[PDB]
């Protein structure tokens with residue numbers, strides 16, 4: 004095959020530098036089409052002779068005189084004539100056929116004039132439309148990530164083919180231009196038309212095409228300067244800067260950059276950091292070097308309405324993207340098969356960098372619930388895959404997009420956290436710096452990081468490993484999943500096997516290592532740290548570390564640094580149960596959560612009885628902390644999904660009423676009758692949860708608290724007395740006890756609500772009514788754009804259906820109106836996949852399964868839009884629910900009655 008029919012560029016030509024000039028036309032040509040025009044010069048060097056130049060180019064029309072490009076040699080160098088220039092749409096190339104051959108060592112210059120659509124497609128140079136008062140606003144902006152730089156100018160669009168960039172923006176004279184670097188001086192008017200200005204930027208460092216940004220907008224900024232001269236900014240809409248919504252972002256940014264310079268032991272590699280908050284940026288955040296983009300809602304904070312988990316969301320999201328300004332942007336993985344390393348690393352260090360920024364919080368631990376047990380859910384299936392793909396299997400752009408998933412991000416973060424711990428942080432940082440210094444401004448594989456990490460381990464004696472860093476990490480990176488470690492504390496025998504939540508699963512993917520790992524096992528005996536231990540690549544082993552006496556106990560994986568789950572024999576489970584029931588402080592708080600999360604998974608797997616899982620929740624009546632309570636609530640939400648319309652819900656609610664009441668009393672005292680919030684994050688979280696859990700399980704005191712506070716608010720609309728933290732539980736539980744006086748009030752608020760995060764709580768709360776007629780009225784309002792935004796409709800319908808009274812109303816509403824695929828699939832995508840997956844989440848009977856097969860029957864026409872085969876996932880899921888409910892409804896019921 005010809006080289007223009009392969010997806011990977013040649014390596015015969017390498018870029019040195021590009022001059023790129025873009026001119027976006029923010030006012031359409033009256034046909035309705037917005038466009039941009041560009042000019043580009045790329046200077047590249049020749050490595051081996053070639054008579055063809057191949058460069059990426061996507062949805063660009065060339066307007067160059069004669070051929071699609073003009074070509075020159077730098078200095079005294081001469082260049083062959085062009086024979087022709089073709090576009091090849093499939094592999095996204097511009098091809099320049101030459102009448103002779105480029106020559107090794109010579110630099111050449113390629114020049115193009117072009118234009119494309121300035122579409123609202125969140126790819127390449129694109130447009131974004133927002134509303135400032137009456138007026139329509141239209142900005143230009145970029146998302147290059149993955150393979151879209153080539154959509155904006157022609158370039159050697161692969162991550163390792165790095166170069167310098169001289170960016171110019173030609174824009175309307177009263178707008179501001181931003182790019183990766185500072186602007187060169189002052190904008191000056193365009194000679195041919197002085198309504199336009201021309202802003203030139205300082206030349207970039209050597210960098211990859213996918214990290215470019217340019218933005219033309221009205222935005223303004225709050226600014227700060229660190230002592231070391233680095234100019235920091237938060238850019239947003241004019242009305243948003245004014246309200247001080249940029250202030251939290253500006254406050255944490257400095258500290259975060261400081262933390263990472265010390266952590267990476269390398270200084271921020273650029274003169275400034277712009278961070279910009281864009282309306283409707285649905286990729287969420289993009290770590291463009293020196294110009295990081297966020298959806299507006301994620302960056303911005305309003306402290307008078309936002310809860311602590313908005314605040315925690317802002318700081319972590321900021322820490323993630325700023326971590327990339329070194330690891331990712333300064334040192335760059337060579338190809339998209341290694342994206343796990345880049346995104347995993349960031350996904351892990353986001354916690355460290357934010358822990359520093361809010362010093363008295365302890366954010367670090369939140370990786371356990373938020374990432375580790377989250378990904379474990381999907382990595383303990385047979386449909387999973389290993390972190391590494393071979394390079395030669397990732398070629399197309401669609402294949403490249405498949406790299407951006409839960410495994411890449413969260414398991415990446417999880418094995419890297421594990422790696423760091425077993426080495427120790429100090430050792431981890433040593434080889435981490437060694438990697439950056441050595442590779443700065445160049446490209447790497449994950450093998451390069453291991454080699455440097457090896458170098459640091461080799462350079463000391465204290466920390467000893469069963470094998471090389473590569474051999475150990477090959478077990479976590481080349482095969483999918485993770486082990487379950489079983490411990491018989493009678494003999495001290497210890498085993499391992501690939502853990503799968505379905506005990507009847509058929510793993511078809513085969514591993515070089517036959518699902519055997521090398522596993523770091525930290526251990527605690529009667530509350531006291533033991534020697535660290537390594538389980539080798541064997542199914543069975545024995546060690547006296549794990550042998551218990553009659554009245555000793557043993558617990559594995561401290562702080563759940565290891566990426567595995569633990570099962571012990573029944574005697575040791577009970578000793579741990581007694582221990583937690585009598586003095587919970589002897590077991591660290593992450594492991595009080597572990598014992599819960601792990602046993603529920605071990606139950607689903609038929610490796611313990613489900614009653615054992617439920618026994619591990621018993622100690623919670625004494626538990627003051629976030630994470631144990633969180634583990635129980637997450638593990639029990641499926642139970643609630645299957646049983647909230649059955650005989651089981653009574654004994655269940657009564658059990659949670661009994662367990663959470665002491666914790667509610669505690670916060671009534673600690674907060675001084677709900678007037679002032681707890682000190683740190685973890686305790687505010689525990690509180691938010693205790694109130695939530697009290698109210699939904701129908702404790703009389705939380706019910707009373709809500710009615711009060713919502714009444715105080717109704718007699719004084721302008722002075723909201725409910726702290727932001729507690730609003731979603733108060734709002735929901737007071738609309739439930741009330742009727743149309745409380746519902747019509749909150750709908751008056753939601754229609755007038757300015758902020759997105761208030762409106763989300765109001766919408767969700769409006770779906771907690773127990774009046775059938777209100778919910779059916781609400782469902783009617785979801786398909787009216789004036790009342791409910793198109794993009795909120797399916798969200799809103801799900802909130803209604805989450806309400807048990809709402810389940811049959813939503814199902815009838817979906818089924819009936821389903822035909823409006825052909826207004827909201829050509830009316831917009833509409834997320835049919837999400838709607839169905841939510842409205843049918845509960846279905847757990849033979850009768851309901853037939854109703855889904857019966858709904859299915861209108862195959863003719865309609866189709867399912869995108870959510871075709873999320874309807875098969877429903878039917879599959881439904882079968883698996885029926886089967887689970889038969890096996891469990893009996894024993895669960897007895898267990899809850901027995902313990903309430």
Ligand SMILES: *[C@@H]1O[C@H](CO)[C@@H](O[C@@H]2O[C@H](CO)[C@@H](O[C@@H]3O[C@H](CO)[C@@H](O)[C@H](O)[C@H]3NC(C)=O)[C@H](O)[C@H]2NC(C)=O)[C@H](O)[C@H]1NC(C)=O
Nearest residue numbers: 021022023043044045046077111112113114169170171203
């Ligand atoms: C990529 O863009 C660069 C920035 O625009 C270009 O570099 C600039 O080129 C100009 C000439 O092309 C130089 O400016 C002035 O040019 C006049 C010609 O009318 C000369 O007499 C002067 O020597 C010069 N002015 C002064 C005060 O010296 C700039 O010197 C130069 N700017 C830089 C390097 O920052 C590149 O040429 C362009 N690349 C390609 C391949 O075209």
Ligand SMILES: *[C@@H]1O[C@H](CO)[C@@H](O[C@@H]2O[C@H](CO)[C@@H](O[C@@H]3O[C@H](CO)[C@@H](O)[C@H](O)[C@H]3NC(C)=O)[C@H](O)[C@H]2NC(C)=O)[C@H](O)[C@H]1NC(C)=O
Nearest residue numbers: 034036037038039040062063064065066117118119120121
């Ligand atoms: C990049 O090039 C594309 C392909 O050359 C352009 O798309 C074509 O633009 C044509 C002319 O501008 C359009 O043709 C017809 O024009 C009449 C005259 O006014 C319209 O009413 C018609 O609706 C239209 N014909 C049809 C069938 O719609 C076409 O829309 C289109 N043709 C093809 C073959 O793709 C892009 O305009 C151009 N884009 C940029 C940003 O430069």
Ligand SMILES: *[C@@H]1O[C@H](CO)[C@@H](O[C@@H]2O[C@H](CO)[C@@H](O)[C@H](O)[C@H]2NC(C)=O)[C@H](O)[C@H]1NC(C)=O
Nearest residue numbers: 019020021022044045046077167168169205206
């Ligand atoms: C982008 O601008 C930079 C710096 O302003 C240019 O780098 C210069 O390149 C010239 C011509 O090869 C050299 O003689 C100079 O030594 C370089 N100057 C500096 C300060 O590094 C770069 O050439 C420009 N890019 C393009 C594609 O023309």
Ligand SMILES: *[C@@H]1O[C@H](CO)[C@@H](O[C@@H]2O[C@H](CO)[C@@H](O)[C@H](O)[C@H]2NC(C)=O)[C@H](O)[C@H]1NC(C)=O
Nearest residue numbers: 030135138139140175176177178220221222241
């Ligand atoms: C930048 O200049 C343009 C040039 O016309 C302004 O556009 C007008 O803005 C006013 C007030 O907001 C509107 O009533 C007009 O309808 C706008 N005209 C067009 C064609 O859009 C623009 O508002 C200026 N803005 C800033 C922030 O400088």
Ligand SMILES: *[C@@H]1O[C@H](CO)[C@@H](O[C@@H]2O[C@H](CO)[C@@H](O)[C@H](O)[C@H]2NC(C)=O)[C@H](O)[C@H]1NC(C)=O
Nearest residue numbers: 247248249250251252253254255304305306314
């Ligand atoms: C970000 O920091 C600024 C100050 O560096 C904080 O602003 C405070 O708010 C009061 C309100 O009366 C101002 O008068 C003062 O300028 C500020 N200082 C103090 C100590 O209150 C701002 O609140 C910070 N924002 C966040 C969300 O942390």
Ligand SMILES: *[C@@H]1O[C@H](CO)[C@@H](O[C@@H]2O[C@H](CO)[C@@H](O)[C@H](O)[C@H]2NC(C)=O)[C@H](O)[C@H]1NC(C)=O
Nearest residue numbers: 014017162163164165337442444445446447448
């Ligand atoms: C990707 O990075 C490697 C380094 O990881 C670059 O190769 C280094 O280049 C400098 C100058 O070429 C040399 O001093 C070293 O000998 C090279 N190291 C090697 C070969 O391992 C490499 O050029 C980069 N690739 C691309 C496409 O830019």
Ligand SMILES: *[C@@H]1O[C@H](CO)[C@@H](O[C@@H]2O[C@H](CO)[C@@H](O)[C@H](O)[C@H]2NC(C)=O)[C@H](O)[C@H]1NC(C)=O
Nearest residue numbers: 490491492493494495496497498543544545572
């Ligand atoms: C703990 O480890 C060993 C396996 O190496 C087990 O002991 C063996 O049990 C089998 C019974 O089929 C005998 O053939 C071997 O002779 C035994 N070896 C001994 C006692 O040294 C032991 O059963 C394991 N305990 C468990 C799984 O609870």
Ligand SMILES: *[C@@H]1O[C@H](CO)[C@@H](O[C@@H]2O[C@H](CO)[C@@H](O)[C@H](O)[C@H]2NC(C)=O)[C@H](O)[C@H]1NC(C)=O
Nearest residue numbers: 365367368424525532561562563564591592593
């Ligand atoms: C397990 O995690 C806890 C935090 O969840 C660690 O306890 C902290 O340890 C540091 C320094 O080692 C102390 O300054 C803090 O006072 C402790 N904080 C809290 C909130 O307890 C504990 O060290 C971890 N244990 C292991 C073995 O890693």
Ligand SMILES: *[C@@H]1O[C@H](CO)[C@@H](O)[C@H](O)[C@H]1NC(C)=O
Nearest residue numbers: 529530585586587588589590
């Ligand atoms: C529980 O044990 C810890 C640590 O060994 C001790 O500090 C604490 O006072 C004990 N609490 C009770 C109630 O016995």
Ligand SMILES: [Zn+2]
Nearest residue numbers: 323327346349
């Ligand atoms: Zn990232």
